[model samples]
Target: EDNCIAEDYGKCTWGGTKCCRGRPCRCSMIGTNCECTPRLIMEGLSFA
Candidate 1:
């Protein structure tokens, strides 16, 4: 499978449990792992 953008968040991270922006964030998969994007949508942050 490709990937899914969260409900309405600009930030994306590999499936895991964590607290972000004061929100309870978590994700999981049976046969997959999170892959970090090159850039963050709302933050305009990139790592190369």
Candidate 2:
């Protein structure tokens, strides 16, 4: 799933549960900053 966790000068999405399964998150540079937004929550999945 995709979730917004950080807001930069133009707003960015980082830190959310990804389907990487246990592997490290992949980072990519869009222009300058490294877009590394991959995290998993142990609480559980919920919908609002």
Candidate 3:
């Protein structure tokens, strides 16, 4: 791809099909939908 949304990604959920970088990406379960969240496992002010 040419871009990446470091934020919550797309609207609501279903963003799991996209991509994430610089951090751990996962298709987290939210209510009944899917959310592409970045799980930071390192130090520093890593805002995900």
Candidate 4:
């Protein structure tokens, strides 16, 4: 996770959750693309 992209390709490179680790709502790229985030109840909500 230390070397995660947290962006475009980052999501698939196992950086999604790790990126999300930094902060909630700001889901990773592959995690959420950071676009118009529609819904995400709370932190760890994307723990899936």
List, residue by residue over 1-48, the lDDT tens digit for candidate 4.
265334322433223444333423343545645422223575333333
Best by TM-score: 3
TM of each candidate vs. truth: 0.23, 0.23, 0.26, 0.22
**Candidate 1 overall lDDT versus native:** 0.36
Q: Show where candidate 2 strays beyond 4 Å.
A: 1-14, 31-48
Cα displacement (Å) at residue 2, model 4: 5.2
RMSD of each: 10.8, 10.4, 5.9, 7.5
Better of 3 and 4 by lDDT: 3
List runs of model 3 lying over 4 Å from the truth.
8-21, 30-34, 42-48
Ranking by TM-score: 3, 1, 2, 4
For 1-48, candidate 3 gives per-residue lDDT tens digits of 566545544422344333344433444455554444445356312343
Better of 3 and 4 by TM-score: 3
Model 4 scores a TM of: 0.22
Clashing pairs in 4: none
Clashing pairs in 2: none
lDDT of 1 by residue, 3-37 (tens): 44433233445445222322332233543443333
Report how far residue 46 has shifted in candidate 3, in Å. 5.3
A best-first ranking of the candidates according to their lDDT comes to 3, 4, 1, 2
Worst 10 residues of 2 by lDDT: 5-14
Off by over 4 Å in 4: 12-17, 24-39, 45-48
